[PDB]
Amino acid sequence: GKIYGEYLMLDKLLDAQCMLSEEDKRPVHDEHLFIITHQAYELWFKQIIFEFDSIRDMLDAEVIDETKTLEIVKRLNRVVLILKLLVDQVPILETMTPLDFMDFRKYLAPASGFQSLQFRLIENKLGVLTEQRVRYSDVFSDEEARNSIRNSEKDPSLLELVQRWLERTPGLEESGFNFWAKFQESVDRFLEAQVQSAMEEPVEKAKNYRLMDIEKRREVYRSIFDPAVHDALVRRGDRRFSHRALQGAIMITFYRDEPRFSQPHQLLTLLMDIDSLITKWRYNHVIMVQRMIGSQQLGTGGSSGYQYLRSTLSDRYKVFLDLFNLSTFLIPREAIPPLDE
Amino acid sequence: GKIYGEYLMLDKLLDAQCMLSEEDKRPVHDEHLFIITHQAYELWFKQIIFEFDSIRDMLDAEVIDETKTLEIVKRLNRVVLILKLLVDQVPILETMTPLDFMDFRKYLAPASGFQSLQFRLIENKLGVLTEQRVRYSDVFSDEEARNSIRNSEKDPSLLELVQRWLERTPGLEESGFNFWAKFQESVDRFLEAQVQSAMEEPVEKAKNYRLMDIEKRREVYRSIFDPAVHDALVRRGDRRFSHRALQGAIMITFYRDEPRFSQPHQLLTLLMDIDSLITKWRYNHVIMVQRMIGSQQLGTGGSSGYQYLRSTLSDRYKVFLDLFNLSTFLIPREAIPPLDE
Amino acid sequence: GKIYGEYLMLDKLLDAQCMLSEEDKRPVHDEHLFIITHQAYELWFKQIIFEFDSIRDMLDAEVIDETKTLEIVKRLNRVVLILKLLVDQVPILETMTPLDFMDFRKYLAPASGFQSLQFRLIENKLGVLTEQRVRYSDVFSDEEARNSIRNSEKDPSLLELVQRWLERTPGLEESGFNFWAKFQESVDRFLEAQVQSAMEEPVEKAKNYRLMDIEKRREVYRSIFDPAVHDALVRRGDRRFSHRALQGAIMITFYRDEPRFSQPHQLLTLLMDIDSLITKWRYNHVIMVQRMIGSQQLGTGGSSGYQYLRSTLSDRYKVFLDLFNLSTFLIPREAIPPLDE
Amino acid sequence: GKIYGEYLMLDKLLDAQCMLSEEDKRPVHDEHLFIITHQAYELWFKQIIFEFDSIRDMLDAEVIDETKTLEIVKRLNRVVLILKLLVDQVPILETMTPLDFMDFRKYLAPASGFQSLQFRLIENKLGVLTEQRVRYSDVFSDEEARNSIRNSEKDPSLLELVQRWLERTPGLEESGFNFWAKFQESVDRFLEAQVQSAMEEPVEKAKNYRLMDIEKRREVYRSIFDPAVHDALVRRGDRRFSHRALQGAIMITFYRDEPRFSQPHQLLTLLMDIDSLITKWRYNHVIMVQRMIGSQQLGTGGSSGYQYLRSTLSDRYKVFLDLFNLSTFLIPREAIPPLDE
Numbered sequence A, B, C, D: 001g002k003i004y005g006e007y008l009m010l011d012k013l014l015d016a017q018c019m020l021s022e023e024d025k026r027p028v029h030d031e032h033l034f035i036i037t038h039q040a041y042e043l044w045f046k047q048i049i050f051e052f053d054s055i056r057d058m059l060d061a062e063v064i065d066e067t068k069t070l071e072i073v074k075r076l077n078r079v080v081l082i083l084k085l086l087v088d089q090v091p092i093l094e095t096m097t098p099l100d101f102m103d104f105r106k107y108l109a110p111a112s113g114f115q116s117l118q119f120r121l122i123e124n125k126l127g128v129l130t131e132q133r134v135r136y137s138d139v140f141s142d143e144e145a146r147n148s149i150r151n152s153e154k155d156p157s158l159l160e161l162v163q164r165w166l167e168r169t170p171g172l173e174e175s176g177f178n179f180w181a182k183f184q185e186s187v188d189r190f191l192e193a194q195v196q197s198a199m200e201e202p203v204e205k206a207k208n209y210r211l212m213d214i215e216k217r218r219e220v221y222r223s224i225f226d227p228a229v230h231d232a233l234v235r236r237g238d239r240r241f242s243h244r245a246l247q248g249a250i251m252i253t254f255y256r257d258e259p260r261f262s263q264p265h266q267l268l269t270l271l272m273d274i275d276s277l278i279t280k281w282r283y284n285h286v287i288m289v290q291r292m293i294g295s296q297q298l299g300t301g302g303s304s305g306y307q308y309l310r311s312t313l314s315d316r317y318k319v320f321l322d323l324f325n326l327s328t329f330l331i332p333r334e335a336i337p338p339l340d341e
């Protein structure tokens, strides 16, 4: 179009609000809010997908320069703001009372939140593993929806592309900076100095606490320095990243204050914020489900739905799970290998 | 429809996003965000209108009981939450850079924010007076849009209906409680006691300050006790309310802690919050216009647009202007006529 | 005092910021933010306690009128707003980097979040049961702190006082409205009508699903109509409320649209919002702990602390647990016993 | 100290809450909220000052590297988050009713918001010019407060230091990139091409509108290319920046997408966000003053105070006024001189 409403296709957009309670000559006022709220979510889901696909295209390249990294950071930050808005949309729908919802939920019988193609496309494009999902894709009767999901699982997710970018971190290379080995030998040097300082403790409980603590540190570093331990944790589902991607991620977090790593760090932080905000939506949605129809109601066949949503709050659904635990492996500033390159 | 996407008409809704930069084979990524942002606004504008029209129907009645008042309060509070969300949508669009916007604003030449039928319908249904508007309704080329605006100006606004409800306040009546006269004579009694206390001041500057202050209080009460002064202020545009509606509003604010007036008070407060939040959107929108194209750019013909938006921030656009100044006329708790009925 | 700084005792308040890294001639800039953030929390914790104690005094009375209920609702809503602000304070402290925190966390060795007297007083005054707490009160070395906690556990909590108020609900009484029996017999009448409608189903899978569903409804109502089942669930820790308090709570939620119950309903909703917002703070605090020092760091002696905080997210810490599940027991509007009194 | 309360000096901090209505044996509950709210503001004002002074020290240097720029950006962003929290604190105090405030505002007679030393120190350290202030520093009776303000006006503000940093922008130099001249000659080339395109317009109203518009563009560029026009606008108070600082600011906004300028751009954006958020606090504070005591009340001596606060909303109080208008001078991407260096 050309003028405001023609450009925005308001003739199409504002003709998609059909209250089924109205067409059945028993209108329920808040059903208009129910529709509008979901359509605002679906509009922003399309925007999120559009931004995710553009970030996937920029990450599916041999090298990602400082200019392309800034663009990726901008678009990830935009997704963060849209996710906060989407979390904030819940109290607007929580304004409808359970009895008003009960008077129209009968018209929704075949419909299901599981049938949101865009919500699934978001989960898949970010990296929610099909094997890590709770049992409880085949809900989608349409063939274009099934084809859309097939492509989202087949094509590389944001998790795979970020890992590839993380593995190519300059500075990890043995030929050059050799960060991983410098980190291993400074961890050994630091942890021994901690043993020597604890040996000089005037009190025995304090000497023993420090020594027990150093042993727990030894085990923490063993989970990342022994690749067999890391690869076993990845297999269990406690980690997502490859051993080399984790090395890159750890190096980015160590040198975040350096101009060269501040932007890659921000990209990782926004990836974490996205995960955390999708989890916040899941929680607020399960609180709202509970407020409206409790753990189970007429038509639900028990607390099956409720318990499934409650189970989506687990680390099984966090894509960049590894990013939250990087500070466990941190060493003081004085102990970090200085940058030379 | 029946299943999720058919119920929500996602086939229609998600087919209304046409980037003109894409159809011209010169696509600008952030134009997708520009469209989606406006469509989320337009969806919520429709919800606001739907709630406003339902509140108008409940207020266009002989008596509004405690049950219907609770429903009106709920729906006004819902509009408050939607307005906060709409204010919060601005930083999402402020994520687009001026240079990216400059690469597609050429395709928008005939379009204008003035062509938002729903934004005008919101202003009119709330009560933005046609005579109080800045010079700078005839923008709308379509006949259904012109007819929609004609009806919104003709049919009673939220301002007119609230005034009618306010005029019917029980307790204002001479036959019963006679609040206005009790308020006048307690104002006189309180202000004289203030003169007597100031007369006993040991310091002359303090006695004189108190006496100058009591004189300014006398003039404040004169603007509401002399109907000629109030009616002149309404004529100037400094007030909106009729003299009897203002009496009701003042009585509701005085006895807000009493169960009988707490709900009418909350209705008035939410009416104020709505005004204040529409003003907050106007401000954030003028800040965003400024960030994107400054006070004037190529195609604007000077700072005409900018200065008009900047002028919409004035009290000329506040519908319930009177509601913000009710605390100027307040007297201590000890001086308020006790409720009997 | 009398002037601004003397009234606010800014001489005392702005002399309580002692950076231990500064006194050790190794200053860490963000330690100032660490102190200020905690002091803003402690100031608002004192305000929360002050409001909680005033609500406890109003609830520790024979009858609570409509006027005192409005005051309680106002103060509960104030606590909600302060809790949202406190949740929002986390991203301000998350602005400090893990390496900057690592350079001063050594000076905090004896200090512990467990030593916040005001946080414990908040938990106790709301109603966090001492037996429902995770093993992991005796941390407090001072005698006035131990005496403060002793009194908070001994004196009635907000949970006990709300239950007393809920038990005294007019309308529950057999002598008058007899709500519980009317609810039981309308549940029986409604559930049988649902069996008869399911019997007329043309499809067998649909008839069987409806019948399986009605059986699950029968069991839900059994948990509240058989007092032995409710009393067993209270004993297990799945419920907090007495059988009579639950009856009152259910009646308030059923007739919330009625002027008589809207205010008691709002009080219950704000009580739920408080619980939910304290849970949101706990979550954001465990995310921030994780961002700063992961699941374990030098000095922690393993993931003991982290796992304890992670366990505070369970229903074991939700005081008004029962309030979230009231919609499970809801019946359509057509099936609710009409109000007469 | 060493343990939680000793480290945070909670013995001092939680002993600074003296309600004057309580000491006069006429306690007003919400006076506790009034005190706590102001003390939370004063605590965060101290944090803001601490961050501002550290940014002043980093900016008072010959060269500011990419590493020091990241630190400045981090601390400015922290101030943004604290300012949002401070804006959000207003609705918490707006929870107190005007009648409850009226029962204790008598004890505040000598106190005044003008006596907040920290609020003035914030305004001065940011750059609120003493000559640009409204008539209505000498309020401060204490000598350490007068000395604190004297030093804040004497020592360079954030506005002066940012201008110095902006003037040293590499790329502005004639010897090297010579941005200003390249910008002038590309503006001339672009504006002439616009005349030639308008000359080919089939419609005369369209040709004339385009030509009138190009003339308004010519005048816009004249205000920045003729230093006499810029220096006259600075003198009038419509601009703050020196002609060379404005050149740097314009160059940073033009090449913001380039890695070299993205961080300097972010610093400028956060400086704008700070200005805008202090303005948002001023507005919310004048709305809250109005809600509590209207435009004037007993003790105010008329609307003097109210009108002064209402006048602080003007551009006279915006420190980085110039930053909001930089998009007025923008040219399309195709017209921007390519970077070489």
Ligand code: HEM
Pocket (backbone or CB within 6 Å): A037, A038, A041, A042, A093, A101, A111, A112, A113, A114, A116, A119, A282, A285, A288, A289, A292, A293, A305, A306, A309, A312
């Ligand atoms: C009145 C409020 C709502 C209720 C009672 C509700 C209830 C439910 C229930 C019971 C489920 C489980 C499967 C099913 O029966 O569909 C579900 C899933 C879902 N709903 Fe909602 N919902 C509400 C509002 C919303 C809104 C506003 C959205 C946003 C678009 C939404 C999005 C979803 C999604 C995406 C799922 C999938 C859950 C996941 O796999 O993580 N719901 N909902």
Ligand code: HEM
Pocket (backbone or CB within 6 Å): B037, B038, B041, B042, B093, B101, B111, B112, B113, B114, B116, B119, B282, B285, B288, B289, B292, B293, B305, B306, B309, B312
């Ligand atoms: C890129 C950001 C935007 C820019 C540069 C912009 C610019 C403008 C300008 C210059 C005007 C004056 C008349 C005209 O030329 O149309 C205007 C008016 C208006 N715009 Fe925007 N706008 C933006 C985003 C939005 C958004 C997201 C909305 C929300 C739906 C919106 C709604 C309106 C409305 C309703 C008016 C009427 C103003 C009033 O009468 O108070 N604008 N806009």
Ligand code: HEM
Pocket (backbone or CB within 6 Å): C037, C038, C041, C042, C093, C101, C111, C112, C113, C114, C116, C119, C282, C285, C288, C289, C292, C293, C305, C306, C309, C312
């Ligand atoms: C730099 C950020 C912070 C870190 C790393 C941190 C870490 C921790 C840890 C590890 C614990 C477990 C016991 C202990 O070692 O003290 C804890 C408990 C606690 N912290 Fe924090 N904390 C941080 C900030 C805060 C803030 C800003 C507050 C607010 C006043 C706070 C309040 C508490 C409270 C009240 C507990 C008790 C937890 C409960 O029983 O639910 N913490 N913190």
Ligand code: HEM
Pocket (backbone or CB within 6 Å): D037, D038, D041, D042, D093, D101, D111, D112, D113, D114, D116, D119, D282, D285, D288, D289, D292, D293, D305, D306, D309, D312
């Ligand atoms: C009950 C709410 C409040 C009322 C009625 C109120 C009223 C006023 C008034 C009338 C003035 C003008 C001079 C005077 O008489 O002091 C003023 C100034 C001021 N107040 Fe408030 N105030 C309130 C709350 C606050 C809060 C919570 C803060 C935050 C610390 C604050 C900070 C200030 C500051 C800094 C000024 C200086 C204004 C400027 O120069 O821009 N006020 N206030």
Ligand SMILES: Cc1ccc2cncn2c1
Pocket (backbone or CB within 6 Å): A038, A108, A111, A112, A113, A114, B004, B007, B008
């Ligand atoms: C339309 C619709 C139906 C069911 C549902 C569940 N969660 C969101 N939903 C939306």
Ligand SMILES: Cc1ccc2cncn2c1
Pocket (backbone or CB within 6 Å): A004, A007, A008, B038, B108, B111, B112, B113, B114
């Ligand atoms: C589509 C469109 C065009 C112009 C405009 C101005 N303010 C919002 N707008 C939206």
Ligand SMILES: Cc1ccc2cncn2c1
Pocket (backbone or CB within 6 Å): C038, C108, C111, C112, C113, C114, D004, D007, D008
């Ligand atoms: C001072 C201090 C020490 C330890 C701690 C843990 N969570 C908050 N904390 C505050």
Ligand SMILES: Cc1ccc2cncn2c1
Pocket (backbone or CB within 6 Å): C004, C007, C008, D038, D108, D111, D112, D113, D114
């Ligand atoms: C204590 C106090 C007195 C007066 C005042 C005005 N604005 C904030 N204020 C605070």
